[PDB]
Amino acid sequence: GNNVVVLGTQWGDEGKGKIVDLLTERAKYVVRYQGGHNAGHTLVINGEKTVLHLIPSGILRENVTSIIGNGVVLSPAALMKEMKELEDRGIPVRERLLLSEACPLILDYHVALDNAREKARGAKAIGTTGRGIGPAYEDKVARRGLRVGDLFDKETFAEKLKEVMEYHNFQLVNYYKAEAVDYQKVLDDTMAVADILTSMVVDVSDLLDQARQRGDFVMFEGAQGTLLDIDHGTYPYVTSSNTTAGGVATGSGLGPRYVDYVLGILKAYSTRVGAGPFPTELFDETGEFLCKQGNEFGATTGRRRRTGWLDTVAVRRAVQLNSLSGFCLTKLDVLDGLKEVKLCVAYRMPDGREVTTTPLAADDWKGVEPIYETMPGWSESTFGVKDRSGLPQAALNYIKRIEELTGVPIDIISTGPDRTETMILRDPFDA
Amino acid sequence: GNNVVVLGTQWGDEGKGKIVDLLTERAKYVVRYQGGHNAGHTLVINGEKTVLHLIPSGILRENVTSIIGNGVVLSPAALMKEMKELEDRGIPVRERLLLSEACPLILDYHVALDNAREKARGAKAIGTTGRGIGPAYEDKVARRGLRVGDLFDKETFAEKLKEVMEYHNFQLVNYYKAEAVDYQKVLDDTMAVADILTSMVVDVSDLLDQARQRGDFVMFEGAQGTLLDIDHGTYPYVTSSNTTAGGVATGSGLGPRYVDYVLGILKAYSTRVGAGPFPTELFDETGEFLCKQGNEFGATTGRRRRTGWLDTVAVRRAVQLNSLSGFCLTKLDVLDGLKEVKLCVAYRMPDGREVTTTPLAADDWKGVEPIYETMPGWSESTFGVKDRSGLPQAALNYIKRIEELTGVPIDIISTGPDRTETMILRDPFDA
Numbered sequence: 001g002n003n004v005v006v007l008g009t010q011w012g013d014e015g016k017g018k019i020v021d022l023l024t025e026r027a028k029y030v031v032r033y034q035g036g037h038n039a040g041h042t043l044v045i046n047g048e049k050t051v052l053h054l055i056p057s058g059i060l061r062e063n064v065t066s067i068i069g070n071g072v073v074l075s076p077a078a079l080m081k082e083m084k085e086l087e088d089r090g091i092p093v094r095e096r097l098l099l100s101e102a103c104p105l106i107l108d109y110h111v112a113l114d115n116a117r118e119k120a121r122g123a124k125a126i127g128t129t130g131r132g133i134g135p136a137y138e139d140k141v142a143r144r145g146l147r148v149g150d151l152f153d154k155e156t157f158a159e160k161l162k163e164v165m166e167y168h169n170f171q172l173v174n175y176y177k178a179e180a181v182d183y184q185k186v187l188d189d190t191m192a193v194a195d196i197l198t199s200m201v202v203d204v205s206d207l208l209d210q211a212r213q214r215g216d217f218v219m220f221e222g223a224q225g226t227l228l229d230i231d232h233g234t235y236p237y238v239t240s241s242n243t244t245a246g247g248v249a250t251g252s253g254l255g256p257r258y259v260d261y262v263l264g265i266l267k268a269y270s271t272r273v274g275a276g277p278f279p280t281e282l283f284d285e286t287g288e289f290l291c292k293q294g295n296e297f298g299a300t301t302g303r304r305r306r307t308g309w310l311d312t313v314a315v316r317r318a319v320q321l322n323s324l325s326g327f328c329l330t331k332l333d334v335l336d337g338l339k340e341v342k343l344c345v346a347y348r349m350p351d352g353r354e355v356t357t358t359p360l361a362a363d364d365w366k367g368v369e370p371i372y373e374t375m376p377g378w379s380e381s382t383f384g385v386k387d388r389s390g391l392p393q394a395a396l397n398y399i400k401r402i403e404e405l406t407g408v409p410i411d412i413i414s415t416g417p418d419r420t421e422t423m424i425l426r427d428p429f430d431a
Numbered sequence: 432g433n434n435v436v437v438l439g440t441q442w443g444d445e446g447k448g449k450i451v452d453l454l455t456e457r458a459k460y461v462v463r464y465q466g467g468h469n470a471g472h473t474l475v476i477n478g479e480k481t482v483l484h485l486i487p488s489g490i491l492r493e494n495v496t497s498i499i500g501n502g503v504v505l506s507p508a509a510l511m512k513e514m515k516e517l518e519d520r521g522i523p524v525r526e527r528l529l530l531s532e533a534c535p536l537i538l539d540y541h542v543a544l545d546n547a548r549e550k551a552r553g554a555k556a557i558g559t560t561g562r563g564i565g566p567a568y569e570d571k572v573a574r575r576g577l578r579v580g581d582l583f584d585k586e587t588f589a590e591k592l593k594e595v596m597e598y599h600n601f602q603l604v605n606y607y608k609a610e611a612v613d614y615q616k617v618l619d620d621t622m623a624v625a626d627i628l629t630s631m632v633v634d635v636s637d638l639l640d641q642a643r644q645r646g647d648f649v650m651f652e653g654a655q656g657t658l659l660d661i662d663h664g665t666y667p668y669v670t671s672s673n674t675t676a677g678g679v680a681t682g683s684g685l686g687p688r689y690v691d692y693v694l695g696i697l698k699a700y701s702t703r704v705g706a707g708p709f710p711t712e713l714f715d716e717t718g719e720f721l722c723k724q725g726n727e728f729g730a731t732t733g734r735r736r737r738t739g740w741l742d743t744v745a746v747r748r749a750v751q752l753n754s755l756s757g758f759c760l761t762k763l764d765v766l767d768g769l770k771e772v773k774l775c776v777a778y779r780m781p782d783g784r785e786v787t788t789t790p791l792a793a794d795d796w797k798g799v800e801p802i803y804e805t806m807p808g809w810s811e812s813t814f815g816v817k818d819r820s821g822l823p824q825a826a827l828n829y830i831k832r833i834e835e836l837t838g839v840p841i842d843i844i845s846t847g848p849d850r851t852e853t854m855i856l857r858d859p860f861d862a
């Protein structure tokens with residue numbers, strides 16, 4: 001179809017950046033519709049390595065318009081830093097990047113709440129919560145937060161700000177016993193960029209509607225894993241926003257019936273970062289092997305992610321929630337050399353009952369036994385292969401099986417970090 | 432299509448109850464996916480007139496199953512009230528109703544927070560003092576709240592309740608200087624009906640997928656007006672949750688691509704309750720005529736029910752947001768007797784530009800002048816008419832200009848309050 005959605009179908013880290021980058025070469029628009037400054041996309045800005053957490057990689061492409069829909073919470077501090085880093089590198093950001101007037105603003109006190117909460121709520125251990133995303137979403141639903149559009153009328157901005165801050169400072173001092181955030185500073189910091197921020201504001205919904213009508217290629221990229229969905233993920237080990245493809249309408253303004261193709265980035269094996277149920281998890285040699293061959297490390301205070309086999313049950317849930325059109329399998333090569341490969345085909349419940357659906361209504365994941373299916377592995381490398389013929393039969397059978405168990409075709413296969421190492425069996429846009 | 436979404440396209444009060452009752456004769460499943468206990472649907476049963484704000488109207492039907500999706504914030508109190516009302520009028524609710532374990536719970540403290548907030552700074556203003564929908568949504572986003580699914584583990588429920596009730600009581604007492612909320616009571620109030628609740632629990636998205644395979648008729652029911660959507664409405668004069676068709680996916684777990692038809696309920700003229708932009712508002716005898724002849728005097732639900740001409744510029748935004756498939760024009764009869772009739776086709780901006788798209792959700796709305804296209808009216812009666820030949824050439828001309836300005840057909844036309852006072856040109860289910 002023409003409106004393409006690309007998201008992670010598991011618990012994050014599916015390896016979606018390369019796919020996103022490759023699909024941006026044919027797209028007219030790239031739209032972020034959820035999350036905040038946590039996109040995590042590492043790019044090579046002419047020899048120099050750089051990560052982008054807010055601005056879409058489509059920004060590097062000359063004929064592409066990068067859009068930040070109302071679903072993304074925007075820290076002005078974060079955008080300016082990225083804008084400057086990019087413009088410093090020759091990229092004319094301010095003319096390829098558009099924002100919604102409805103984006104919720106993340107200010108100092110928002111981050112302050114997070115920092116405060118992690119101390120008490122969590123503990124003195126890897127408590128990386130410095131961001132302020134959640135609090136921004138919270139103020140949004142409580143109808144007490146600020147939006148980019150509010151910057152258009154300064155007088156009111158200041159009044160609105162003042163009120164939300166006294167409310168927040170109260171909690172900071174009298175409940176968390178943290179410092180208060182200074183009002184004048186927030187106001188001055190924000191007013192300092194108000195004209196920049198609102199100069200990039202556009203009527204996003206109408207814009208996208210015009211593109212749809214003209215048949216332009218529009219790519220919607222999700223930043224977090226499907227199973228981290230606040231609503232359908234594994235509560236409470238979920239993020240502050242909806243991550244499923246259904247979040248595209250709300251977070252961008254485009255109607256639901258306009259999603260043509262939903263590309264689900266699927267990793268060959270599974271990983272999880274932190275607490276949460278993970279039935280296929282491996283606590284042995286094979287695990288350690290996936291972690292090593294896959295380089296499943298943080299790249300920042302990395303404690304080394306949890307590994308395990310591909311969970312077909314877990315993936316069936318994501319097919320449902322996202323109405324997946326096809327998969328893009330990644331890291332197939334990471335498995336190169338395993339005498340045998342496993343894939344969970346069902347969960348066995350404590351009572352004996354076997355299921356193809358993931359746990360609901362309490363009766364938690366606490367005791368699901370994974371029913372695996374053992375496949376022989378392959379020795380012949382799959383790294384770099386650019387055609388289904390370079391792929392050994394074993395590799396093919398495995399892929400073949402995933403398709404059968406899910407009922408969704410693997411339309412793209414990734415076999416290396418570079419863009420040339422990619423197999424396209426269908427193509428999201430022209431099909 | 433088998434999956435039908437139905438909602439009002441303006442600021443509510445579009446006359447959708449009748450349509451929903453109608454469409455409910457073919458629906459196998461009727462689902463609520465957004466908001467809370469502010470969805471007023473009036474009905475007659477044991478000769479008495481009963482109003483439901485939570486339970487789906489389809490509860491009257493026998494071979495229909497009603498479902499409250501995870502998108503609805505649920506108040507046990509309000510669920511027991513309606514439940515009992517129906518049990519009393521001989522309807523086996525326990526049998527026909529189903530609920531998501533992911534529905535956030537609304538407890539007394541949430542109502543306290545809401546009430547404290549508006550019955551405070553700026554008493555005579557616009558904020559809260561009511562149902563407690565925003566606080567429950569907020570707890571959900573902060574991830575500190577309780578879900579229907581917590582009722583299974585009664586032990587964990589009681590301590591969880593204590594941790595969160597401690598957090599709000601502090602707020603209530605110290606910041607609002609208000610009565611705290613007795614924990615023992617809330618705990619006792621929820622235990623009293625926990626078992627009742629957990630029995631109605633089901634995996635909703637798994638259930639909606641099976642229905643989708645066997646071809647069952649699923650009607651998704653919207654509760655508020657489209658232009659009141661938290662994100663895309665006439666902010667700040669907005670409601671608590673999302674009101675556009677975008678929430679069916681996040682709100683029920685149904686994949687976005689599986690929505691077949693979106694029916695937008697559309698009143699033949701405009702109304703709005705309370706504060707807020709309203710470009711086509713009347714300040715002459717006509718606005719008084721449309722109110723009196725339309726029974727809009729704080730009748731169905733109001734207090735400040737302003738009246739005006741239909742706004743195609745606003746209606747087009749509604750088309751855009753919901754991917755409208757077809758319109759159902761309601762209260763055609765109200766315009767019976769008018770000399771002329773008007774439609775807003777463009778907004779003149781205070782500067783001077785004449786636009787056709789909704790100005791940004793924060794611009795000179797109170798300062799925008801609507802451009803109208805006038806049309807001859809009809810002395811003949813439309814009321815009661817049950818066949819489009821029986822409608823006057825003037826009427827079936829107005830009908831066509833709406834079609835032509837919105838670019839969406841009107842598949843159903845309501846000519847009076849009786850169920851039989853309806854014309855179904857197409858039927859969302861067969862389309």
Ligand SMILES: Nc1nc2c(ncn2[C@@H]2O[C@H](COP(=O)(O)OP(=O)(O)NP(=O)(O)O)[C@@H](O)[C@H]2O)c(=O)[nH]1
Pocket residue numbers: 439443444445446447448449470471472473654655731732760761762763764765845846847848
């Ligand atoms: N004359 C006339 N009355 C109508 C028509 N459709 C509905 N009504 C009447 O006008 C009101 C419409 O309200 P109702 O059908 O309850 O829907 P609603 O209150 O808009 N639904 P919600 O509040 O959930 O959006 C009712 O009092 C109803 O009897 C119509 O086409 N013509």
